[PDB]
Amino acid sequence: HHHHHHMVHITLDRNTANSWLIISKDRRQVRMGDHQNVSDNKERFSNYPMVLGAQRFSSGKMYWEVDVTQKEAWDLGVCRDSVQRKGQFSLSPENGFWTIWLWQDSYEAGTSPQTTLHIQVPPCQIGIFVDYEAGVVSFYNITDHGSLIYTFSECVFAGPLRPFFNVGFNYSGGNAAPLKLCPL
Numbered sequence: 001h002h003h004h005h006h007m008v009h010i011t012l013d014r015n016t017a018n019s020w021l022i023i024s025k026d027r028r029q030v031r032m033g034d035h036q037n038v039s040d041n042k043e044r045f046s047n048y049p050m051v052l053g054a055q056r057f058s059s060g061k062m063y064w065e066v067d068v069t070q071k072e073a074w075d076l077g078v079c080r081d082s083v084q085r086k087g088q089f090s091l092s093p094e095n096g097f098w099t100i101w102l103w104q105d106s107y108e109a110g111t112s113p114q115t116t117l118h119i120q121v122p123p124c125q126i127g128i129f130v131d132y133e134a135g136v137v138s139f140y141n142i143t144d145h146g147s148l149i150y151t152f153s154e155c156v157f158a159g160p161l162r163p164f165f166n167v168g169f170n171y172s173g174g175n176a177a178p179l180k181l182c183p184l
């Protein structure tokens with residue numbers, strides 16, 4: 001792919017984070033803490049270890065990269081600014097999410113129902129491309145020379161978009177590693 005020139009500098013929005021997350025001083029890394037002594041607010045994801053990027057996108061082409069090295073479970077993509085924050089929900093375009101994930105040694109796209117991904121080289125870094133006007137979200141395997149993972153097309157965004165992250169639970173003791181926004 002030749003999307004690298006649409007690179008944007010993403011930072012995490014502390015105020016949206018689940019109360020167990022630890023965001024680095026530079027707002028470029030997030031991990032599961034083992035409650036982080038913050039007040040509750042209506043923006044925080046309550047049920048899952050999720051956080052949003054601070055940036056909002058309503059036009060144009062945007063590209064960023066995320067490091068997932070040594071994690072067992074995570075979700076990545078974009079979502080509407082107005083997604084539900086409280087209680088249980090599924091990650092689907094109907095609920096305002098365009099995501100992929102790793103879970104139990106399989107990769108899947110967040111369609112409803114979910115779609116099996118075919119990845120021969122487990123990624124250490126994921127590239128995410130959004131074309132707002134075209135209604136496209138695409139995912140790339142940076143570890144495998146940028147190979148395509150998945151394209152959501154005919155997307156109905158229906159509002160501003162935010163970068164979306166889930167570090168996953170760490171019931172196993174094998175999923176403590178952070179998500180990291182990789183430099184341009």
Ligand SMILES: O=C(O)[C@H]1CCCN(C(=O)Cc2ccc(F)cc2)C1
Nearest residue numbers: 018019020045046047048049050169
């Ligand atoms: O499985 C369980 O009982 C624990 C899971 C994580 C810790 N638990 C909490 O209630 C607090 C919490 C909830 C959601 C979240 F994303 C992060 C922290 C219960």
